[PDB]
Design a binder for this molecule. Structure first.
Ligand code: CDL
Ligand code: 6PE
Lengths: 446, 34, 105, 425, 55, 34
């Protein structure tokens, strides 16, 4: 009986509080018996310099390996024994540590996150152990062409800036990174005004804020020293990187233009345009009858094994484009059909397909915020980027504002006659020359 | 997208002992979609 | 049902025998012009009807070479002309009309 | 204040024809409807193997009420989703969309499940997708090992693979698809589950369209455990191996004992890049093996049988040392060496993992659908935790004893030069 | 004596065949079932081998 | 020509019982030549 619009109002408001040391504490209560809690830190490779690049990824390997009060196995045995799950990740702008556990285990869970973020042991015997482990992971990542081609895209698109740096760091920095480099990274970036304690599930916001005062109070905050980090802008460069390797059976291509960044209202309309182009895989059932002309033609003529659009967001910048993988004789056809859809939407987008892109986005947004861990991530990441939780009803308002005119104007603002950043890897002899790619960013008929 | 679940293009390599944990099975499930 | 509808059928049988493709052993659907809809319908025929269509066209092309025809006993009788392709072609057209109606929205 | 509403209860109804409707109104922006069917690969026989795979791939072919074009464009227009999930016992047609579009996707779901035409040319064009689907699946070495593990354990009806045998690709006929739907997609073999939908409309839909009278009754073709071993010498870098014995059918109290035994031994990690201290199988192998490896307890419970054991990944030369170390670790539990704190930590991992697996609508719908076919009822989570608490330490030990003394089934793939046969364990 | 005097790089191996038994079943689309049922009998040259040849 | 001996292009069909005799095996031998 309840309508879709009415269901957006029923979602509980995300309660936000802030301690006296700058640590923000946010929660979304539900009736669940489980929950997710974690700390989102405004740190990443974009803050690291060339000498200490990969330091954050190194700390991730040491965060769960021992603390001053829980050395070695003690942390794992506590997490495992209560059936909880402990995880972490690191992007170029955000680092996160979160726990999944029962609701009754909320106080123990927060207590462990505090001991992890603040009292990391970093034993020299352990640092040498993780030195070889990260090096093996670097060899593993080399075999994932998708991870390679997207690192190349960042490397060439943001060349000369911190964003070109990968999260893992270069193999030479992992070998010469000392314990002092890591502690310097922690005291510099793991500061209370730059962290957000997020929770989601069955829990009242009071007990979270109490636990925040109980365990995170002992953390220097609101004035460290005259050592404040600040993210400068990062130059985007139209450029091309081509790793020719004819031993690999399929080529990987990633092409993109410069996006606006996290806070720009244009991201909503861009995601609608990307949803129209959508994504494809050889295991999809639709094939020729798919709505997306690129997916239909890619399946009918077998131009690729897969493609995906993306809108990667960073502070005041981003990578907007698509990535695909295909046989060595389909790289040209695939690039042609892809660019033709950017130009078609820049110039002659229609109302019905734009409604499909809005409906795909509404379904994507609600399907993603299903579970305590997705919502806990949305809380933590949003407070760092947006400084607030944007309610679902607001996203619906911005989506409903988009129409065909918005897509034509917004797509032309970022796509039409713009220099892309191209990254290629594999059998890419047939990858078009950059000038030919650059000419595909405008139409002579328009 | 097609999915194969068991834990309860050259893909990649898994060499170290840390990346191997979670690979051992724990009943297959085959999902297909549009 | 009445004497007048037998006269419309009477001239249709006249035009049928005047069209003369029955003299070569062909059927009406063998003579249709192959557009994209017709090519798909032929593609959907079962194996037996496809092989029968192929031999009748082959036999008629062999006769057309020699400027000959079949004996009258072997001509295609108007009453026995099987519209084997029309149900397939009607469905191909119906699908295209649906694609063309979605393209308008 | 910021508190959520009062959560509704799940409505549940059995119709006299055997059909089961269960709905929950969670007031979410999205709706989710699943039709769960006892039509998994177990109901194939040696003349129509792979028919349920091709059926799983044919959800967007033409129906009597909607062409293939309309189903694809109609669902994508509202941003919806249509999925088909298969196990060895069930097929689950799931549909997702915003709650204002439930009616449209319901109509498609019923057409796909109750009025497929299986056109001769559409089916023929779809046959090569079996090769692509199977190839994508089988690049996980786990998939083929567990295919062979079931082929080795059972004489019938669970030896059947989830994926179509190669010799059958292109041979599955439209008649076999029609016969499969008429025989297995019937009222007494079905359950209509819904989220973000009212109970009356599902019950209304169930009575209007899902009243298909049984073409084949609830089959008594019981799975017959036999045991054996299948070995696949290939060029993989690591040896995958699973050693298993018949354990227990799902829903029985003995099944809960094996589930606790699974978490006493260890099944999947809890900490990113953790040493897995509380996993007795991992620590037992790490004693005598210092190379990279992985080990996990395997638990597969079905309607009329079950398979419990463990799964190993190791270097080719360490394959026997890893397997014997793991198997000996199960023996010490069967000899009685099992504390009470060890069992309680296992119950916490089990109870916690069950609750976590039903946080999402995707995991909740799958659980309710599986309970409806397996049990004909809905058991709430607090009752599930109650059943887990009722497992005694002796029940966990007797489950280990049943594994140690039971006729084994084994599947292995890799360079098997140092991988023991069953009689060598 | 001129060419075939290659001295042993590997001696006459004692890697004796170990009978174990079991079964391999191949479900395919052949028209007829082929099946062989067998047990360990005897090494060649022994008197027991001649008995199996008569059998 | 390559040979496979065991009795002590679509090839063909063997249907009747008279043509089947001699098909059952009786140790494989693989021969190759020029
Ligand atoms: C003198 C005769 C003039 C004939 C003009 C023909 C114009 C035409 O066909 O319109 C198509 C053309 C389509 O180009 P598009 O809109 O960028 O779309 C690209 C396609 O998708 C397809 O894009 P594409 O990636 O496949 O190829 C891009 C293409 C784009 O250029 C063309 O296709 C134009 C056709 C070649 C004209 C050659 C001039 C002589 O560039 C070329 O390949 C032409 C290279 C010329 C080689 C000459 C060697 C000496 O549109 C126009 O150029 C119309 C404006 C022309 C100005 C007329 C003045 C009034
Ligand atoms: C009467 C006017 C005819 C105009 C045709 C035209 O200029 O051709 C296209 C190119 C430049 O466009 P592009 O190759 O970047 O393609 C853009 C794709 N979006 O121009 C040239 O360099 C080609 C040289 C022509 C010599 C006769």
């Amino acid at each position: 009986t309840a309508t879709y619009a009415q269901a957006l109002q029923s979602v509980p408001e995300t309660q936000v509080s802030q301690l006296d040391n700058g640590l923000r504490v946010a929660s979304e209560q539900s009736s669940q018996p489980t929950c997710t809690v974690g700390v989102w830190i405004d740190a990443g490779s974009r803050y690291e310099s060339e000498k200490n690049n990969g330091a954050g990824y190194f700390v991730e390997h040491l965060a769960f390996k021992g603390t001053k009060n829980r050395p070695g196995n003690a942390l794992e045995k506590e997490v495992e024994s209560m059936g909880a799950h402990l995880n972490a990740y690191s992007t170029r702008e955000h680092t996160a540590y979160y726990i999944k556990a029962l609701s009754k285990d909320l106080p123990k869970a927060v207590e462990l996150l505090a001991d992890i973020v603040q009292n990391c042991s970093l034993e020299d015997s352990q640092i040498e152990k993780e030195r070889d482990v990260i090096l093996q992971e670097l060899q593993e990542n080399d075999t994932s062409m998708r991870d390679v081609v997207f690192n190349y895209l960042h490397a060439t698109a943001f060349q000369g800036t911190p964003l070109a740096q990968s999260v893992e760091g270069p193999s030479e920095n992992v070998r010469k990174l000392s314990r002092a480099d890591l502690t310097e990274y922690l005291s510099r970036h793991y500061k209370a005004p730059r962290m957000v304690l997020a929770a989601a599930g069955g829990l009242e916001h009071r007990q979270l804020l109490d636990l925040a005062q109980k365990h995170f109070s002992g953390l220097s905050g609101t004035y460290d020293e005259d050592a404040v980090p600040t993210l400068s802008p990062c130059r985007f460069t139209g450029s091309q990187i081509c790793h020719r390797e004819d031993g690999l059976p399929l080529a990987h291509v990633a092409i993109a233009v410069e996006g606006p960044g996290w806070a720009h209202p244009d991201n909503v309309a861009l995601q609608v345009a990307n949803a129209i182009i959508g994504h494809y895989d050889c295991t999809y059932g639709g094939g020729a009858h798919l709505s997306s002309p690129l997916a239909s033609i890619a399946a009918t003529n077998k131009l690729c094994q897969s493609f995906q659009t993306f809108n990667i967001c960073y502070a005041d910048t981003g990578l907007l484009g698509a990535h695909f993988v295909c046989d060595h004789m389909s790289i040209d056809d695939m690039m042609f059909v892809l660019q033709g859809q950017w130009m078609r939407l820049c110039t002659s987008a229609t109302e019905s397909e734009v409604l499909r892109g809005k409906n795909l986005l509404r379904n994507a947004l609600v399907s993603h915020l299903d579970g305590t861990t997705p919502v806990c991530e949305d809380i933590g990441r949003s407070l760092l980027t947006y400084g607030r939780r944007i309610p679902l009803a607001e996203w619906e308002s911005r989506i409903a504002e988009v129409d065909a005119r918005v897509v034509r104007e917004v797509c032309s603002k970022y796509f039409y006659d713009q220099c892309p950043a191209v990254a290629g890897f594999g059998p890419i002899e047939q990858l078009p020359d950059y000038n030919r790619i650059r000419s595909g960013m405008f139409w002579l008929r328009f | 997208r097609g999915v194969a679940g068991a834990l309860r293009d050259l893909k990649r390599s898994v060499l170290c002992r840390e990346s191997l944990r979670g690979q051992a099975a724990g009943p297959l499930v085959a999902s297909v979609s549009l | 049902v009445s004497a007048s509808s037998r006269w419309l059928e009477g001239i249709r049988k006249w035009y049928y025998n005047a069209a003369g493709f029955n003299k070569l052993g062909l059927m009406r659907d063998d003579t249709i012009h192959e557009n994209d809809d017709v090519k798909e319908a032929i593609r959907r025929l079962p194996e037996n009807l496809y092989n029968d269509r192929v031999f009748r066209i082959k036999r008629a092309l062999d006769l057309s070479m020699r400027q000959q025809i079949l004996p009258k006993e072997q001509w295609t009788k108007y009453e026995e002309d099987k519209s084997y392709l029309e149900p397939y072609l009607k469905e191909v057209i119906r699908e295209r009309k649906e694609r063309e109606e979605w393209a308008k929205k | 204040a910021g508190v959520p509403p009062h959560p509704q209860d799940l409505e549940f109804t059995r119709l006299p024809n055997g059909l089961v409707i269960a709905s929950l109104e969670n007031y979410a922006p999205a709706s989710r409807i699943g039709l769960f069917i006892k039509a998994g690969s177990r109901y194939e026989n040696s003349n129509n193997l792979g028919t349920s795979h091709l059926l799983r791939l044919a959800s967007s072919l033409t129906t009597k009420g909607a062409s293939s074009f309309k189903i694809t464009r109609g669902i994508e227009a509202v941003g919806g989703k249509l999925s088909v999930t298969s196990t060895r016992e069930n097929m689950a047609y799931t549909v997702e969309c915003l709650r204002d579009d439930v009616d449209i996707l319901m109509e498609f779901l019923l057409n796909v499940t109750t009025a497929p035409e299986f056109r001769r040319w559409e089916v023929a064009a779809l046959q090569p997708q079996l090769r692509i689907d199977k190839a994508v699946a089988l690049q996980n070495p786990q998939a083929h090992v567990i295919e062979n593990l079931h082929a080795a354990a059972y004489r019938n009806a669970l030896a059947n693979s989830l994926y179509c045998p190669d010799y059958r690709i292109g041979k599955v006929t439209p008649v076999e698809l029609h016969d499969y739907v008429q025989n297995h997609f019937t009222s007494a073999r079905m359950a209509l589950i819904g989220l973000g939908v009212s109970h009356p409309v599902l019950k209304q839909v169930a009575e209007q369209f899902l009243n298909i009278r049984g073409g084949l009754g609830l089959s008594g073709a019981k799975a017959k455990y036999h045991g054996g071993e299948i070995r696949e010498q290939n060029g993989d870098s690591l040896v995958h191996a699973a050693l298993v014995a018949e354990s227990a059918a799902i829903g029985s109290a003995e099944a809960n004992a094996f589930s606790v035994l699974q978490h006493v031994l260890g099944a999947g990690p809890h900490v990113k890049r953790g040493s897995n201290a509380t996993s007795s199988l991992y620590q037992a192998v790490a004693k005598g093996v210092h190379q990279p490896f992985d080990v996990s307890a395997f638990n597969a419970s079905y309607s009329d049988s079950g398979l419990f054991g463990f799964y190993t990944i190791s270097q080719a030369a360490s394959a026997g040392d890893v397997i014997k170390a793991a198997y000996n670790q199960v023996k010490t539990i069967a000899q009685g060496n099992l504390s009470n704190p060890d069992v309680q930590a296992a119950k916490n991992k089990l109870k916690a993992g069950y609750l976590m697996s039903v946080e999402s609508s995707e995991g909740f719908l799958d659980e309710v659908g599986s309970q409806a076919l397996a049990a004909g009822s809905y058991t709430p989570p607090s009752t599930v935790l109650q059943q887990i608490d009722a497992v005694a330490d002796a029940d966990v030990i007797n489950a280990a004893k049943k594994f140690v003394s039971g006729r084994k089934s084994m599947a292995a793939s890799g360079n098997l030069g140092h991988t023991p046969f069953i009689d060598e364990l």
